Amino acid sequence: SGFRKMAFPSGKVEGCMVQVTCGTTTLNGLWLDDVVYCPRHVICTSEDMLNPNYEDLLIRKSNHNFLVQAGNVQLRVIGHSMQNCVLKLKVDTANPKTPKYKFVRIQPGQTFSVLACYNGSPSGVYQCAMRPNFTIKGSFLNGSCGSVGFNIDYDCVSFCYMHHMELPTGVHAGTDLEGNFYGPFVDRQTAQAAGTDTTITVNVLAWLYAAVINGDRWFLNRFTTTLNDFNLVAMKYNYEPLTQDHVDILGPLSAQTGIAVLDMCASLKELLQNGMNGRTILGSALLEDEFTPFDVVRQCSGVTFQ
Amino acid sequence: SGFRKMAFPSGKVEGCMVQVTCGTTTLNGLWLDDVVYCPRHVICTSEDMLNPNYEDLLIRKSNHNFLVQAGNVQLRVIGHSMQNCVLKLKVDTANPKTPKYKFVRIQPGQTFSVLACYNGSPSGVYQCAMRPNFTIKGSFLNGSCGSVGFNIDYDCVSFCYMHHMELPTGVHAGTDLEGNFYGPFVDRQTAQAAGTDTTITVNVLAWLYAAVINGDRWFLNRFTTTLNDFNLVAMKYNYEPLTQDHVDILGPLSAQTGIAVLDMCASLKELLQNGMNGRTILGSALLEDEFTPFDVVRQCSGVTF
Numbered sequence: 001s002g003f004r005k006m007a008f009p010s011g012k013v014e015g016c017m018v019q020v021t022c023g024t025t026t027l028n029g030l031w032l033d034d035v036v037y038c039p040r041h042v043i044c045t046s047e048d049m050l051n052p053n054y055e056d057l058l059i060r061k062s063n064h065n066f067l068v069q070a071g072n073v074q075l076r077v078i079g080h081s082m083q084n085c086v087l088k089l090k091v092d093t094a095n096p097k098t099p100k101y102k103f104v105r106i107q108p109g110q111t112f113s114v115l116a117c118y119n120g121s122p123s124g125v126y127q128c129a130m131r132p133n134f135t136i137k138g139s140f141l142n143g144s145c146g147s148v149g150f151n152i153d154y155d156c157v158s159f160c161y162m163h164h165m166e167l168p169t170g171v172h173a174g175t176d177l178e179g180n181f182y183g184p185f186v187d188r189q190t191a192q193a194a195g196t197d198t199t200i201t202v203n204v205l206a207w208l209y210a211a212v213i214n215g216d217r218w219f220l221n222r223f224t225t226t227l228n229d230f231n232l233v234a235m236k237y238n239y240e241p242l243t244q245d246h247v248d249i250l251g252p253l254s255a256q257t258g259i260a261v262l263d264m265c266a267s268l269k270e271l272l273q274n275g276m277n278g279r280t281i282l283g284s285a286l287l288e289d290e291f292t293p294f295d296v297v298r299q300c301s302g303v304t305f306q
Numbered sequence: 307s308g309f310r311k312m313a314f315p316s317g318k319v320e321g322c323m324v325q326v327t328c329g330t331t332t333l334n335g336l337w338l339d340d341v342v343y344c345p346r347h348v349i350c351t352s353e354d355m356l357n358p359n360y361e362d363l364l365i366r367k368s369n370h371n372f373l374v375q376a377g378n379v380q381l382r383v384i385g386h387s388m389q390n391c392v393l394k395l396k397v398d399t400a401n402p403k404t405p406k407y408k409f410v411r412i413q414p415g416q417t418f419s420v421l422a423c424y425n426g427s428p429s430g431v432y433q434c435a436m437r438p439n440f441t442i443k444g445s446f447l448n449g450s451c452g453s454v455g456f457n458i459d460y461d462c463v464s465f466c467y468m469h470h471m472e473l474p475t476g477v478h479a480g481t482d483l484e485g486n487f488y489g490p491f492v493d494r495q496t497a498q499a500a501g502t503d504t505t506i507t508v509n510v511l512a513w514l515y516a517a518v519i520n521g522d523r524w525f526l527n528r529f530t531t532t533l534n535d536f537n538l539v540a541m542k543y544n545y546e547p548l549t550q551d552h553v554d555i556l557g558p559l560s561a562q563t564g565i566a567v568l569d570m571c572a573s574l575k576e577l578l579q580n581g582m583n584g585r586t587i588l589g590s591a592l593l594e595d596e597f598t599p600f601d602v603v604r605q606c607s608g609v610t611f
């Protein structure tokens with residue numbers, strides 16, 4: 001038993017991290033086969049970032065303007081192209097540690113592990129959720145750009161996030177590995193803001209199921225609700241709508257605990273109306289929404305990765 | 307900016323994990339050079355566990371009673387010895403992925419990463435503190451025994467924890483890599499209970515300094531405290547005493563922020579009195595005590611490995 005915010009083991013991703021330098025800008029790149037992926041803003045000075053024309057900035061760069069370092073080993077750049085907000089550096093050396101991998105774009109509410117890096121070297125690993133406002137609450141200092149987020153399924157690393165930006169509120173924004181931003185953000189130093197955020201309802205319900213699995217049941221009640229009546233109440237509390245798909249995804253946790261999804265919805269309904277009355281759930285005085293249904297099942301059933 | 311509970315990258319440890327089977331019992335082992343380290347209870351059945359005599363159980367074993375699997379490769383056991391509550395299986399093959407490593411015994415309050423494993427395969431990585439009552443608040447299912455806890459300094463893995471047991475409260479107990487239990491716990495299925503736990507005061511203070519470094523000052527006040535008046539108050543909230551050593555360890559964070567350690571102690575005193583009044587500190591509605599002063603500096607300064 002016990003329930004912790006748990007990252008995927010980072011080894012397969014650690015073997016993919018490199019340092020990318022262009023002029024006075026150094027950040028991280030992801031080295032898969034013979035391509036290094038990094039934020040295209042590696043080609044910018046702080047002055048360029050005010051109003052960059054990435055096409056024009058890049059056309060002035062040659063292969064030898066890009067210094068790629070994999071630990072101690074200099075990789076020679078033999079080609080470069082941009083895809084959306086990611087630069088792709090073709091190198092002379094295929095990464096021999098390249099894992100089985102996919103590039104996947106995730107939905108708001110989905111979690112991933114971040115391997116925070118500086119100078120192509122890992123600092124640490126933590127879990128993030130893609131918020132409904134397409135930000136993440138990360139821990140990123142200057143030089144962290146090009147750090148990635150990922151999930152593992154068996155032996156397949158699904159890369160879902162590359163780090164580009166910190167917003168004024170101290171939350172973080174980035175792209176998928178095809179360089180498409182999550183959220184209405186641009187890679188220019190201009191006035192940009194996290195939108196009003198909402199609570200990831202399906203994840204709170206997953207975490208209530210985690211609480212029940214772990215012996216915390218005080219919030220269960222004799223009541224039920226329709227999906228419709230649940231959503232009418234929860235939307236007043238800036239909770240995301242719960243869909244039939246969310247209900248279906250909670251099926252396995254409902255079956256393991258013997259608590260019908262709509263019965264857990266009735267419990268959550270009462271929690272939103274009454275608060276906790278000074279009690280805690282899994283050692284938290286807040287309703288946690290950064291655990292997916294899969295995160296709970298994976299942790300509570302000991303799923304491993306080969 | 308931002309501040310998260312952050313584990314060490316697990317790659318160096320992932321390369322050390324194997325599966326150890328003795329009879330019907332399967333758990334995890336740690337393969338460094340030509341030795342596999344695992345809990346000595348791998349030689350027990352559930353029936354053996356009430357009052358096992360491990361000397362007597364072990365002398366009955368041959369090398370070939372121990373099945374060690376490193377992925378697809380069977381490692382041949384060529385010797386075994388017991389050191390306190392750990393079994394050392396000598397194997398015919400040195401682990402080529404052996405990192406630079408040390409075995410360390412940590413103090414209560416110190417943090418480490420756990421790589422939770424089943425069947426010699428990693429499930430996930432999280433950060434833990436050795437509680438003052440010598441338990442850890444982990445996430446461990448049956449089969450997790452032999453999962454290890456560790457710190458990294460650059461390229462050196464310091465192994466500090468091996469997982470043996472879950473207590474009735476759902477907290478966890480284990481040993482150092484020399485097989486000495488943290489706390490008064492024993493590897494027997496006897497009634498054993500976590501003592502009353504306390505809050506790791508020096509860590510709460512570190513985390514308040516993390517909050518200040520991250521741009522949040524709402525909880526500060528105009529007051530100071532003597533160290534003695536601080537301890538008199540905080541002990542009423544089941545906080546560990548703060549020692550002059552703890553004050554000294556908070557020096558660098560105090561100097562970075564311009565907040566005197568005793569001034570931060572005055573803030574903590576008021577937080578315990580008032581609570582948060584609907585606010586959070588670094589996204590938490592409770593006072594977090596599983597970040598050391600070093601964890602804060604490491605994370606706020608971007609130390610890499």
Ligand SMILES: CN(C)c1ccc(N(Cc2cc(Cl)cs2)C(=O)Cc2cncc3ccccc23)cc1
Nearest residue numbers: 041044045046140141142164165166187188189307
């Ligand atoms: C000099 N360069 C290349 C440069 C590149 C990126 C940044 N910025 C600002 C912006 C990024 C985007 Cl995308 C639009 S505006 C950042 O947000 C980088 C950044 C990322 N993550 C934590 C940070 C923490 C502090 C300061 C900057 C951080 C500034 C300069």
Ligand SMILES: CN(C)c1ccc(N(Cc2cc(Cl)cs2)C(=O)Cc2cncc3ccccc23)cc1
Nearest residue numbers: 001347350351352446447448470471472493494495
């Ligand atoms: C059959 N075997 C070898 C065996 C070995 C250990 C255990 N126990 C009970 C005890 C361990 C110790 Cl040390 C003394 S009593 C555990 O606590 C293992 C364990 C560890 N971590 C999460 C657990 C969660 C559920 C159940 C058992 C868990 C039981 C059988």
